[PDB]
Design a protein around this ligand. Structure first.
Ligand SMILES: Cc1cc(-c2nc3ccccc3s2)ccc1N
Ligand SMILES: Cc1cc(-c2nc3ccccc3s2)ccc1N
Lengths: 115, 115, 115, 115
């Protein structure tokens, strides 16, 4: 509910299906601890990463494994992955959608924060 | 069902709400005839523009009235509107989503074509 | 000099070379009159479209012929072209760079306005 | 010369000036070692980060300090920074331009790779 990831393919004009996504939370020692992960669905979406109880304020990193996605399509890509790093705050809207639009040599990302 | 428009605001990190959208279809005389229109919802989406029966193959133009959107937020914009021009074909997937991500001096658009 | 167009290819990570560009200006009768045209160089850039004297106040449309670009590379893209429509020089003369980043099913455009 | 960074502001339609950029290279022990750093000029560009001799094969991370950029302009943005991670020079030496287009809740990045 509170954190969703959506991935789109700008070459095929389609959801980016079966993309691995890893979420990390910054620890007190300034290391990235694993938090949640999954693979995007047939709709390009990854739901159920976390719960309101566990998604406390902090710095989070969403890593989208774009290189493996392009390699599986036979397309040489530029990036190792796409990383989205942000602070979650409780004074802001409650639902976070991290969206990424992928091309072999480019990506765009935006946050949609609602409620 | 066959044609949906989704608009996002990259300044606020939100759906772009109440954006006027006008759809045109190219006529035989190479003029743009009005086809469908509406305003985006609270989710930034505009549904119900057309039906499968009416959405025949042809060249379509989706005009998103970005200038009025930014002016209503007190932000000086660059573009008069964002225009998305494309051919609809029956050999391709059946549902078209035209997505646009808006900033005052920039926009990005992508097509998600599924089924 | 006062109007430059730069086009990049997000699939190859390269300038988009030999892209046709047509510029129009809205006339008093609300028709798009031809204003200037050209093709991008090896650097993806198109210079020398107009002069300070000729580039008067008005509403301009920069049409970037993306479909022909992709088709020549063996890709059947979504868009017919990318159109950038804006009011120019209404505060006085300015220098405009219209940049476009192209993918088969997506494009992004931004303006850099100086002076 | 072999590595350049260019940053644009999609809110103002201008180069993003005085943006801090830190480059890291992955070491044999899989740690990110500092490689180069600098700030964008009035043109939004950062030149002279490295040399052909020093810019050997490896995995590099270009960290663009977008949060500090927006905060200085009175905007509380979403991202901590924009990170661009890529393998460089594995086919031989190349010239890399990392471009980023910034909005408060979104960024786009592309690579132009030549030679
Ligand atoms: C980064 C980016 C994202 C999008 C989209 N987000 C969403 C989010 C939810 C549903 C459809 C879409 S489509 C569209 C254009 C760009 N550039
Ligand atoms: C990431 C991105 C970058 C650009 C631009 N790169 C350059 C590089 C050199 C000169 C002008 C421009 S403009 C345009 C659109 C997007 N989305």
């Amino acid at each position: 509910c509170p954190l969703m990831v959506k991935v789109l393919d700008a070459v095929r004009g389609s959801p980016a299906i079966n993309v691995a996504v890893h979420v990390f939370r910054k620890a007190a020692d300034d290391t990235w601890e694993p938090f949640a992960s999954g693979k995007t669905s047939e709709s390009g979406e990854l739901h159920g990463l976390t719960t309101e109880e566990e998604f406390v304020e902090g710095i989070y990193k969403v890593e989208i494994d774009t290189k493996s996605y392009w390699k599986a399509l036979g397309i040489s890509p530029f990036h190792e992955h796409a990383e989205v790093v942000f602070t979650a705050n409780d004074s802001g809207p409650r639902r976070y959608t991290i969206a990424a639009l992928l091309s072999p040599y480019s990506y765009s990302t935006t946050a949609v924060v609602t409620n």
